[PDB]
Each structure stands twice: as structure tokens, then as C-alpha cells.
Ligand binder design. Structure first.
Ligand SMILES: O=C1CN(Cc2ccc(Cl)c(Cl)c2)S(=O)(=O)N1
Length: 135
């Protein structure tokens, strides 16, 4: 066992969202993508195999999948089609995911709170909170 496996592994379904449209605007997502992305009710699937963590987002809008080792930069094409350089670390039990592109930066934190997995997406001063529960 590991902390990561116990906390995060499994299949999660989105149950609430706040300020996601505003977050997407701050990121630079265009109107049509924001509208379609904002409707989605994704499942988030998290798995671990040795040192490799995989996070999948499955929805009618887009399916995404990242696999990574903590602390080790990788390439990511986001749901809104940004080509970013990402680094994910585990800081005090919180997965902290930094994306860099075009001189910009956004941070996504994933954490367990009670029976929820809370995803906080932050761009400058704009935060979106997306809450998931086990499927
Ligand atoms: O709830 C969430 C939100 N995600 C990030 C995410 C998804 C879609 C778009 Cl368009 C953008 Cl800008 C960011 S996630 O995959 O990290 N989980």
C-alpha cells in the first residue's frame, strides 16, 4: 500500500462545480469550448502502478489521460487543446499539478475531503472548485 492508493485510486463522478466558466475564461478558453466543456459531468479515474500514476477524465466533451511520475515533467495536451508542460508532486497529501504554456501557468490541486475528491483549479486569482464522489 501507499498513501496515493488509499486516498485517490478509483473511479469518481462529478457532483458539483463552482466558477469553472470563470476559471476557463482566465485560462483563455474560447466561448464554444467553454460552453461544451462546462456542461460535462466527467468521471475522474485514478490508478497507480508502481511509480506511475494515471489520471483519466472521461466525458461527453473530451476524454483525457495523463500518466506520470511525481516530480518528473511531462507533455500534456489539455481538454481545451493547450500544449502544456506539466509537473505533478504530492505535497502534504495533496496532488499539486502545475501546467506551463506560452509564459502562463495554472495549478490544479486534487485532495480528499471526507468522502469527496475535491479538484481546485487556479489561474491567477480565479479558483474553481469541482467536487467528485465515488462512482
Ligand atoms: O474537474 C476537472 C477540471 N479539469 C481541468 C480542465 C478540464 C477542462 C478544461 Cl476545458 C479545462 Cl481549461 C481544464 S480536470 O480534468 O483536472 N478535472
Amino acid at each position: 500500500g501507499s498513501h496515493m492508493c488509499d486516498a485517490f485510486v478509483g473511479t469518481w463522478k462529478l457532483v458539483s462545480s463552482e466558477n469553472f466558466d470563470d476559471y476557463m475564461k482566465e485560462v483563455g478558453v474560447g466561448f464554444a469550448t467553454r460552453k461544451v466543456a462546462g456542461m460535462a459531468k466527467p468521471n475522474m479515474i485514478i490508478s497507480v502502478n508502481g511509480d506511475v500514476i494515471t489520471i483519466k477524465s472521461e466525458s461527453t466533451f473530451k476524454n483525457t489521460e495523463i500518466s506520470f511520475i511525481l516530480g518528473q515533467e511531462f507533455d500534456e495536451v489539455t481538454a481545451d487543446d493547450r500544449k502544456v508542460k506539466s509537473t505533478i508532486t504530492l505535497d502534504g497529501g495533496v496532488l499539486v499539478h502545475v501546467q506551463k504554456w506560452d509564459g502562463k501557468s495554472t495549478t490544479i490541486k486534487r485532495k480528499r475531503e471526507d468522502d469527496k475528491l475535491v479538484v481546485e483549479c487556479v489561474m491567477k486569482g480565479v479558483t474553481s472548485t469541482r467536487v467528485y464522489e465515488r462512482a
